[PDB]
DNA sequence: TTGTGGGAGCTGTCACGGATGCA
DNA sequence: TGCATCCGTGAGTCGAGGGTG
RNA sequence: UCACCCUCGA
């Protein structure tokens, strides 16, 4: 592992970026602390400040606005 | 004290003395990044 | 002339004036009958009869005959093993490097047991182990890689006393060292005051009188043979205690630290340390060498070889006479023996033990080891269940085999650049090992070349580093002695007559005669014509003596010679120093696609090359029944089928590529012995380690300025200086903490344009050309998931990612290599294949690249003249000769005359004379300077071969001669003067250069030091988990070690800031690294530097040994030298989009 | 937790200043 | 308690390749 | 990659 690989390393994918910056501030929190922090659903909701459902909601929405937003997998 | 083949164990003062050891090893000079090294050729075409 | 001892060997005209009485021996015998010795083959057995050493006893058959019988303590029970016998090899040598194999046969033996008490026998085969075997060229064949045993050198059992001034006082003290081949040592010293006393086994010096008393005998007794000698006298004056039961005990507490002294147990002691043979092994060769210096008993008394209490009496009056130095001593029973001290590195003194001897002793200590297990069993089973079966362990015998072929310093990776190498490589002998002098114990005065050397160890052939005088050749002519000595064969003179009786002598031997030199004068008859000739001296002094005198002549020039050092024509031309570098070099030139054997050579290249076993020979006398490239078919005239399969493109030890070539047809009539198929620097049966180019002696615009060389593009175009080099690449999947790793072609976030040479196993397809990074064997590995990416989890909890969670190790090229893939092999634990514990699956890749010469790569000559290329013009700038031919190298006038290598200006001279043959006119012939040496060499046709043997080489005035009579061109023209030299144009202006320069015939060779070995370079790369600086070597992808002596000199230059930038940000400033990538990655300056990672671990390594370290503020306290976590979040967070 | 049983290698290095330790 | 003797330290730089623990 | 050892290169 070398500067050069640990100075690439972090660069962001500029991809997942784009994917991400398209999605709903709203739905790109929840789906942020869900999935790529991994809270529990009510950490979640206490962070965000709503309720539940709110959260939920908008996780699975951003979920599917994402898969729908991004083909690439790997290529 | 020596492990199987009778080599004296380093210890930790043999980490500091020596030409090996850390001033002189790894202290006093090191491997540098951005260097290389080939064979010379002699190129009289070239200036000073 | 001829040479004709061998069949089919090319005819090689040779210049030498002098008959050669014996041949040289089998090159490789050094070895052959060290292992046979050590086995007892037949061969071996036959050669004990003629050698008059009836009794013959092999190695293993030796370490049995002290091992049996093993008695248990109560002596109920009694186990001995009888006779070795070897079972046929489990795998032949191919297959054994192709499985990482070791090339072994099992060794079985009878062994006996015997039960007093019951009075029953039961005999038995038992299995000892599975035997390393040696191959029939000589080497071994370990864990897969070829291996070669070099002799050592080391100090033969005895007694020897040396002359120690430089005490103190300006006083000649006299010291004696009594060292056996195995157990406990014995030195005798005097002190600058007068005494006498034994230092036995490293404790403080005891009076002598103490164990003369300690052996029996009294103060009456010794007085009496002692009374000559006041020091002895003085000593006993100075006694502490008188008496033999006291004696006993005192030399017990001596022995013995901590524990009480006890009379019964001084006595067993004393009595079992050296005249017992169990702990005290007097060597065979010991025996002899102490009853030749002591005479005590010179009446064939061989029956028991253990110290004499008669041999410790003459050891001590030896000592004690020896200050007084009289010639003639007399032991009470000795005869006459002169009185002086010992050479240590006298080759009579100096023995070697050969590969079957050191095999033996660690086979004695595993036996040793297995008899201590014998006798632990021999207790605690029950009786009448036993059998030699259940006593006999031989895991420790296999573990010292292991530890030796595996850790020893005298097992050594073989060396195969060239046939030559290895021929000497396997005829080597190391001074240092284990049971020899250490590497710190290795002074000026060993490694300088004794007078005794001569004949034994090429004076000329050693390493030029800190291996100097510590690596030497044995010489051609010489054999290892029984006892381990070498010894070289002479001629008897009797009655001033020289006949054909050859008499191998020893350097014990030789010191009483005075030899003549090989190059002498001679009757028809055979007699001396001159007055007085040169002799070495027992001395070895140089001198004169009359022809009567003479006892023995050498058998020959280059008696005194290596292999390799023998095969540098004119070596008689040139000076130690070059003619080292030529004899070292030549093993270092690297095969070529075709070899072309040297126009001018010695008479050695033919059986150096056959000797070498890298080249095919015909076992019996027969007619070629088929020949392919893959094998050769043989009819004999018994009617018997014989085929020798061809080595095709395999990869040597160090990847020179060692092809086999036929060098015979169809229906060809071959008589025994006869070379068959060529191997990869031989040609028609004879060594050719380069290649016969047109060389001009001029500077030309300074690209051949300081040892650079000047080369023609035609070596290029034409493939004359190409080689090829194979190289292997080496790739395991095994099973890891998260699971197995898997080879395969499926390999994440890669395009299918790059998987486009790969199979569907993921690995690389046979042919394809390989570039730096492309994928050898994709392999992928199951990822901990704690280094996964945030946005990779993203993926993996959107998607849902569940079965595969791996990455990307597959095997690439590494940096500034490729090549074509030759070949594939492959082994499966889903298969049945030995593999180490945990790897599943192992692959090697095959890669074969063809360099051509090139700017920067190393060749030279035989006579020590190196050089890199600095440049090579196209073949219309080189300067060419009158008819248009090209020269082929420009070698710089500056580099002949101050390195005192001229061998290569008369090597050029007779090449271009065999280049373009010649014709001496002989009509009234016969001229005076042809009439000597030249027998049928007064004509040759052009390009014809020719040989000039060291020390017997064509003279001056002959060579002179053929510059004259050099036949025309096909024009008629005379292009080479009488001179050497020729009138050259300019091939650039083409006006022709003022003044003849020499040109001519010169054998150059492609050493093995090319660039694209050697240029390295890097940005960044892995670094050490330790220190955090860069790796360092090219196989790691390291960098350069900028060193103190560097400092020094950044220092010197006072720039602070390159040596800051280079000591920081380069190497050790983990911070900074990363930073310096990136600001110059977009463009910004370079930042400050930080603190180097290992002054942080010297901190740490002070505090480890209770040092309490601290920095300190300007005016506070200690300063927190760790970094928080906290700031790398930030711009992670924020490059996700927070 | 029985009755039996004394290691492997070395040294073929040299010069110098100082504390150790012997007699 | 004055002095020999034994002990500890030091003995060029930078490269390449191989093996085994 | 860590430590040895070996054989080399200037």
Redesign the pocket.
């Known amino acids: 592992r070398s500067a050069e690989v640990e100075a690439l390393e972090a660069l962001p994918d500029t991809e997942i970026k784009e994917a991400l910056q398209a999605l709903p501030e709203e739905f790109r929190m929840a789906v942020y602390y869900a999935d790529v922090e991994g809270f529990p659903y009510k950490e979640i909701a206490e962070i965000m400040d709503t309720p539940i459902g709110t959260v939920m909601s908008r996780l699975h929405r951003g979920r599917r606005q994402l898969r729908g937003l991004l083909a690439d997998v790997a290529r | 004290v020596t492990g ?4 004296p164990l ?1 210890s930790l003062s043999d980490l500091l ?4 050891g850390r001033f ?2 790894n202290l006093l ?1 090191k ?1 540098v990044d951005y260097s290389g ?1 080939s064979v010379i050729v002699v190129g009289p075409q070239l200036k000073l | 002339s001829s040479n004709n001892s061998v069949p089919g060997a090319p005819n090689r005209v040779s210049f030498a004036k002098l008959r050669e009485p014996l041949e040289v021996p089998g090159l490789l015998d050094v070895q052959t009958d060290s292992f046979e010795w050590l086995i007892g083959s037949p061969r071996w057995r036959e050669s004990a009869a003629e050698r008059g050493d009836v009794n013959p006893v092999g190695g293993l058959e030796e370490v049995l005959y002290e091992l049996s019988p093993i008695e ?3 002596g109920s029970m009694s186990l001995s093993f009888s006779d070795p016998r070897f079972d046929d090899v489990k795998a032949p040598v191919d297959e054994c490097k192709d499985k990482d194999m070791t090339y072994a046969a099992p060794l079985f033996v009878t062994a006996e047991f015997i039960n007093n008490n019951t009075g029953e026998i039961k005999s038995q085969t038992v299995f000892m182990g599975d035997f390393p075997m040696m191959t029939e060229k000589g080497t071994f064949i ?4 070829e291996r070669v045993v ?1 002799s050592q ?3 033969s059992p005895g007694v020897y006393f040396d002359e120690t001034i ?1 005490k ?1 006082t300006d006083k000649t003290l006299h010291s004696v ?1 009594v ?2 081949s ?4 014995l030195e005798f010293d005097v ?3 007068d005494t006498v006393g034994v230092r036995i ?2 404790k ?1 010096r005891q009076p002598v009188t103490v164990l003369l008393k300690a052996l029996g005998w009294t103060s009456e007794q010794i007085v009496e043979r002692f009374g000559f000698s006041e020091i002895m006298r003085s000593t006993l004056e100075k006694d502490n205690t008188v008496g033999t039961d006291e004696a006993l005990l005192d030399i017990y507490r001596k022995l013995r630290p901590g524990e009480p002294p006890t009379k019964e147990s001084a006595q067993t ?1 004393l009595e079992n340390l050296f005249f017992k043979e169990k ?1 005290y092994d007097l060597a065979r060769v010991g025996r002899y060498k102490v009853n030749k210096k002591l005479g005590l008993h010179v009446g064939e008394p061989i029956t028991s070889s253990t110290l004499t209490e008669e041999d410790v009496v003459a050891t001590i009056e030896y000592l004690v006479r020896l200050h007084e130095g009289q010639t003639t001593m007399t032991v009470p029973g000795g005869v006459e023996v002169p009185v002086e001290t010992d050479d ?2 006298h080759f009579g003194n ?1 023995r070697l033990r050969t590969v079957g001897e050191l095999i033996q002793n660690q086979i004695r ?1 595993g036996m ?2 297995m008899e201590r297990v014998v ?1 632990e069993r021999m ?2 089973q029950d009786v009448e269940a036993i059998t030699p079966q259940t006593l006999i362990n031989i895991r420790p015998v296999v573990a010292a085999i ?2 030796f072929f ?2 020893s ?1 005298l097992s ?2 073989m ?1 195969q650049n060239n046939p030559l190498s290895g021929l000497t490589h396997k005829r ?1 002998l ?14 000026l ?2 490694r300088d070349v004794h007078p005794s050397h001569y004949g034994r160890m090429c004076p000329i052939e ?6 100097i005088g ?2 030497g050749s044995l010489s051609v002519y010489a054999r290892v002695n029984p006892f381990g000595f070498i010894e070289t064969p002479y001629r008897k003179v009797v009655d001033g007559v020289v006949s054909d009786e050859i008499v191998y002598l020893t350097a014990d031997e030789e010191d009483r005669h005075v030899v003549a030199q090989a190059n002498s004068p001679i009757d028809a008859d055979g007699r001396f014509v001159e007055p007085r000739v040169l002799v070495r001296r027992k001395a070895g002094e140089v001198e004169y003596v009359p022809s009567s005198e003479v006892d023995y002549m050498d058998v020959s020039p280059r008696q005194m010679v290596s292999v390799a050092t023998a095969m540098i024509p004119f070596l008689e031309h040139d000076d130690a120093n070059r003619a080292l ?1 030529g004899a ?2 030549q093993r ?1 030139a690297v095969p070529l696609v075709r070899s072309e054997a040297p126009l001018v050579g010695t008479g050695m290249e033919l059986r150096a090359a056959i000797d070498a076993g890298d080249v095919v020979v015909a076992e019996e006398s027969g007619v070629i029944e088929e020949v392919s490239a893959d094998y050769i078919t043989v009819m004999h005239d018994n009617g018997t089928r014989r085929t020798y399969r061809m080595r095709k493109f395999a990869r040597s ?1 160090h ?1 020179t590529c060692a092809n086999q070539c036929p060098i015979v047809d169809a229906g060809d009539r071959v008589e025994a012995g006869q070379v068959i198929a060529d191997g990869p620097c031989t040609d028609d049966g004879e060594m050719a380690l380069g290649k016969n180019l047109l060389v001009a002696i001029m500077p030309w615009e300074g690209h051949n300025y300081e040892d650079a060389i000047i080369l023609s593009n035609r070596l290029v175009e034409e493939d004359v200086l190409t080689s090829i080099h194979i ?2 690449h080496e790739i395991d999947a095994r099973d890891t903490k998260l699971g197995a790793e898997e080879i395969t072609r499926d390999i994440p976030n890669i395009s299918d344009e790059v998987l486009a040479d790969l199979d569907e196993r993921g690995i690389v397809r046979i042919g394809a050309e390989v570039r730096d990074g492309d994928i050898l064997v994709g392999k992928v590995t199951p990822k901990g998931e704690t280094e996964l990416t945030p946005e990779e989890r993203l993926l993996r909890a959107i998607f849902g990612e569940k079965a595969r969670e791996v990455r990307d190790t597959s095997l690439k090229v590494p940096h500034g290599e490729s090549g074509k893939v030759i070949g594939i092999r492959v082994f499966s634990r889903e298969d049945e294949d030995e593999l180490p514990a945990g790897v599943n699956e192992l692959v090697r890749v095959y890669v074969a690249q063809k360099r051509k010469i090139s700017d920067g790569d ?1 060749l030279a000559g035989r006579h020590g003249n ?1 050089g890199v290329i600095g440049k090579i013009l196209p073949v219309e700038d080189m300067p060419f000769l009158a008819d248009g031919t090209p020269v082929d190298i420009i070698l710089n006038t500056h580099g002949v005359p101050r390195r005192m290598n001229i061998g290569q200006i008369l090597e050029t001279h007779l090449g271009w004379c065999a280049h373009s043959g010649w014709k001496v006119d002989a009509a009234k012939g016969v001229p005076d300077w042809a009439a000597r040496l030249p027998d049928e060499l007064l004509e040759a046709q052009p390009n014809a071969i020719v040989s000039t043997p060291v020390f017997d080489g064509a003279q001056e005035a002959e060579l002179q001669g053929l510059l004259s009579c050099t036949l025309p061109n096909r024009d008629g023209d005379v292009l080479v003067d009488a001179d050497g030299k020729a009138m050259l144009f300019d091939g650039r202006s083409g006006e022709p250069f003022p003044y003849p320069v020499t040109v001519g015939y010169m054998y150059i060779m492609k050493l093995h ?1 090319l660039v694209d ?2 240029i ?1 370079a890097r940005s960044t790369g ?1 670094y ?4 955090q600086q860069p ?6 992808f ?9 400092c020094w000199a950044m220092q010197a230059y006072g720039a602070a800031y390159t040596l800051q930038e280079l000591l920081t940000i380069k190497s050790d400033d983990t911070v900074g690294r990363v930073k310096v990538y990136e600001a110059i990655v977009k463009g910004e300056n370079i930042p400050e530097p930080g603190i180097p990672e290992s002054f942080k671990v010297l901190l740490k390594e002070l505090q480890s040994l209770c040092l309490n370290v601290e920095v300190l503020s300007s005016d506070g306290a200690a300063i927190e030298l760790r970094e928080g976590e906290d700031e790398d979040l930030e711009r992670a967070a924020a490059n996700l989009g927070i």
């Open positions: 199987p083949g009778n080599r380093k003395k020596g030409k090996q002189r090893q000079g491997r090294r | 248990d303590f109560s370990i864990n897969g890689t070099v050198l080391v100090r430089d103190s060292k060292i056996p195995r157990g406990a040592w002190d600058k005051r086994d490293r403080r002691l702990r240590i590195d100096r200590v040793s080891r006798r207790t605690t292991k530890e595996g850790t310093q050594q990776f060396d080597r190391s001074a240092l090992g284990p049971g020899g002098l250490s590497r710190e114990r290795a002074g005065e060993v050693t390493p030029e580093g800190p291996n510590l690596i570098m070292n070099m270092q030890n990847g190289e292997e190393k190196k030091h070995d050697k390295h892995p050490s988990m330790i220190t790796l360092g070597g090219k196989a790691q390291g960098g350069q070690r900028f060193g103190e002596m560097e």
